[model samples]
Target: GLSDGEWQQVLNVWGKVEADIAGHGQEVLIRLFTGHPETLEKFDKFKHLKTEAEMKASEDLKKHGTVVLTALGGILKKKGHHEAELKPLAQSHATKHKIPIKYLEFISDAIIHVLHSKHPGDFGADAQGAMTKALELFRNDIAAKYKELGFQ
Candidate 1:
């Protein structure tokens, strides 16, 4: 189970501005793909949209953003119940997308930055740590599969 503090932090930070998740998630994807072009290669939908501007402008990209945020929101909404739901997602990305586990950090970085930008008032060291920990839980789950097969 999640710490009581982590749950409250989600309530304070994310709960306060749930309405802006779509926009926040969208910008996070755009920024991530823009900063790391190769990372964008995994998303077939984003293949046609080369530049960052093109990604930000695409409706399809927004849907992917929603998908990411939806997963994130699910975890945040159900703290401590991370692995159960996140495992299949990790498995899918690992097996289907062939996405290296290294990208998880970049994804977490986007998450940390976006949340801070969206709700600076509620963010502090603890909240940041909590979010980081939550994201890592997801990464570790996905990474475990590869590690098990000696893929590293």
Candidate 2:
């Protein structure tokens, strides 16, 4: 849903985010968990952590955070045209993981919140809008896939 210029703007900002993808990604998951604690139950790896410090120090949390953002990074790099790439994630969330699709919205919000805070200069109106649209497209497509898989 992004124009070519808006797409380029998104990539411009993504370059900055990608440089510290792991760190930013970790913060994103942290933001998600902190903002919506109940969602923490969905993650077996870090669900048992009782303290903020525990979540911050968990290598498993960091690694999975990297995985989450890396997937989105790949899709953004491909200009949001990689339905094939998203299918497996959707399948796993819908079937194996049983992750409610709404959690994807939480993830998206966390991503945006983290990016806006970390890269305010780069994530101006144009890039921010593009990024938002990109996430919406991704989330909607994933929901459609979940329905197709009989999870809705």
Candidate 3:
């Protein structure tokens, strides 16, 4: 559990890190739970999620964060948003799993931190390569976790 001050300190660190990356023209990815549309609907319907089942569902949402992040990053790298690309996968993932958008955002932010910690440098081939490698590693872990949860 984090004290208020400790949480604040964490925010401060994140701010510094974000600023540092931004200074280098690198994207600082942070996804808030409220950023997702489906999540907002769920939140609205539930009014409040205090039950264990609700909590478990929330946790499941969080678990997919890194996978989504890497997949998005991979798309950006390959397609460069040339066409109406990368939509199907994201949309399908969201619909198929009934994943809240907020959870996707959270996972994105979490994966961003993981990327930053592992490869603290400007964006370029080196950074992209590093990110690719990191994503490979992250994918394996996430896959294992998914299998454990019977997500296949």
Candidate 4:
């Protein structure tokens, strides 16, 4: 649900590469999620399907979700610390923009779980290790922010 302004911005960029994007099948949609973390959780509805069902349903969901999550990870690596960074942003954006923070948080948590499940070895020795790292980083960032804001 891109706003008019956002849609215009999209068009502006698309105008430059519309030819490349138009017939690229799902790739163009995938690229859209790459920069927007909030878009990842939009795939939660498909998570519980059986293997074959998931294989079929996930084509579009995974394409979009993976693209969004990948984009989200890149953004988080650059400007976010962990889930804590995500939570506040989710809260603020949800409040200000009339989005649902709880829903966003659910999505973020799911994404983290999915990533660890998929790439535990890449991130750490095990899934718990990876989750610990993510949570620790998030906790530290949240504690720092709390201190900075004099909340504790």
Candidate 5:
């Protein structure tokens, strides 16, 4: 439960970058891979991409990155209103894709890095803290599914 001010920061930052999805979306994915190379192996489709530029240029990565950003955009559009909706998605990822719960935090880290890297001076400590809290809530929602279902 962020303050209205904090939530507004979330909207302002995400709204601007997400509007330029084609440009920044790939950056987030690339950042995720750079920060945690192992995550790249989780995607059978993406695992073979050995270089940063190749991974970013990959058609599958590009398409999937677009879809990921689009879905995330829809989720962020509601902000505090429906973060819990992500729970079902979490369960589905567990059962269907076998994505470990830690990956949620990994991706969350990527998003935070993307914000700071792309926005530079705009993503100050206050905005970072607020976004970090919001992402924690999102990860907690996803982790609940793993806890409930006893998935590894």
Candidate 6:
């Protein structure tokens, strides 16, 4: 669990946009793939796309965006207290997916960017700080799992 202030602040910001998970999720993926092309190659379905326009229109991208954002939204709904679920996810991503933990940071950065850009008033300094801290906890949890699994 987060500190009292951190927990509430995260929920407060998330509440403002939880209603549009798919829409915001798509935007986050757009921003992520556009800004960080290397990440796009991580997904087999996206690696062949050589243009930003193609990425924007890919069904695979949309599906993945929703899946990712939905999970994130659910985590926030729990107020950042989902270590049990996060552990297995970390393990799978590390071993099965062969994904590095650094990618989590990239996605978290995209999340903060999308939240602030889309809801500037709702996610200002205080809210962003809390969200950042919350994401830090998540990253740490995943990192610990990766260490335990001997995947660094």
Q: Choose the strongest candidate by TM-score.
A: 2
Candidate 1 C-alpha error for residue 45, in Å: 1.3
- Give every collision pair in model 3: 36-101, 36-102, 65-107
Model 1, position 26, has a per-residue lDDT of 88
Give per-residue CA lDDT, model 1, range 23-139, as digits (tens): 877888887887778888898878788677787788878877888888878866767566677777767777788778877778779878877777777678987877777677667
Which ten residues in a row are the worst by lDDT in model 3?
Answer: 22-31
lDDT of model number 5: 0.79
lDDT of 5 by residue, 1-152 (tens): 77888878777777766677866677878888888898888888888889998986787776777888777766766766664667678778899788887877888898888887778898889878877877786777777778888888
Which residue pairs does candidate 4 place in steric collision? 34-71
Order of candidates by TM-score, top first? 2, 6, 5, 1, 4, 3
In the range 1-152, model 3's lDDT, one tens digit per residue, is 33344334433433343433332112222223333334434334333544434533553334344344345444434423312434455445444655544354455455455546545673335444444444344343344444444542
Model 6: worst 10 consecutive residues (lDDT sum): 72-81
Model 4 lDDT tens row, 14-93: 23222432223233333333434455334465334434434344566545444444444443343332454355643444
State the displacement of the C-alpha of residue 134, model 4, in Å, after optimal TM-score superposition. Answer: 5.6
Using TM-score as the yardstick, the better of models 1 and 5 is 5
TM-score of model number 4: 0.35
Count of clashing pairs, candidate 2: 0
TM-score of every candidate relative to the true structure: 0.86, 0.93, 0.32, 0.35, 0.89, 0.90
Q: What lDDT score belongs to each candidate, Candidate 1 first?
A: 0.75, 0.85, 0.41, 0.41, 0.79, 0.80
lDDT of 6 by residue, 55-120 (tens): 777877777878887777677667666876687789889998877888888888998999878877
